[PDB]
Write a protein that binds this ligand. Sequence first.
Ligand SMILES: CN(C)CCCOc1ccc(-c2cc(NCCCn3cccn3)nc(S(C)(=O)=O)n2)cc1
Length: 102
Amino acid sequence: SDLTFCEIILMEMESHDAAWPFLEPVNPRLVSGYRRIIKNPMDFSTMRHRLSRGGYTSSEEFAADALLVFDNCQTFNEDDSEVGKAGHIMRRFFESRWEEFY
Ligand SMILES: CN(C)CCCOc1ccc(-c2cc(NCCCn3cccn3)nc(S(C)(=O)=O)n2)cc1
């Protein structure tokens, strides 16, 4: 019953104005040397793939992947960059919705 809310939250994040950096895996042709720094990439497409296939055994596991998206953003980008700002917006949005649903 808790896992059904993850799809709803995922859809809301996919639709958010600030979500553009996170929709698909980082493209290494666009973001030079990404994997030198980010050893465990994550993105909303990968999360959708796993959620749709029972790859999350609990809502907590889904939340951990959401936070990994934002933690990787914060590790790679300065807070005042456009992508860094987007990550902070999305983390706040995610955490707020998580509290409402749970
Ligand atoms: C072809 N299709 C329309 C592309 C649409 C999506 O394009 C993206 C998506 C995500 C990025 C990107 C970048 C970045 N740090 C660098 C910021 C400076 N920058 C370098 C290249 C571009 N901007 N960090 C991150 S993340 C996920 O670690 O926070 N994600 C980039 C492009």
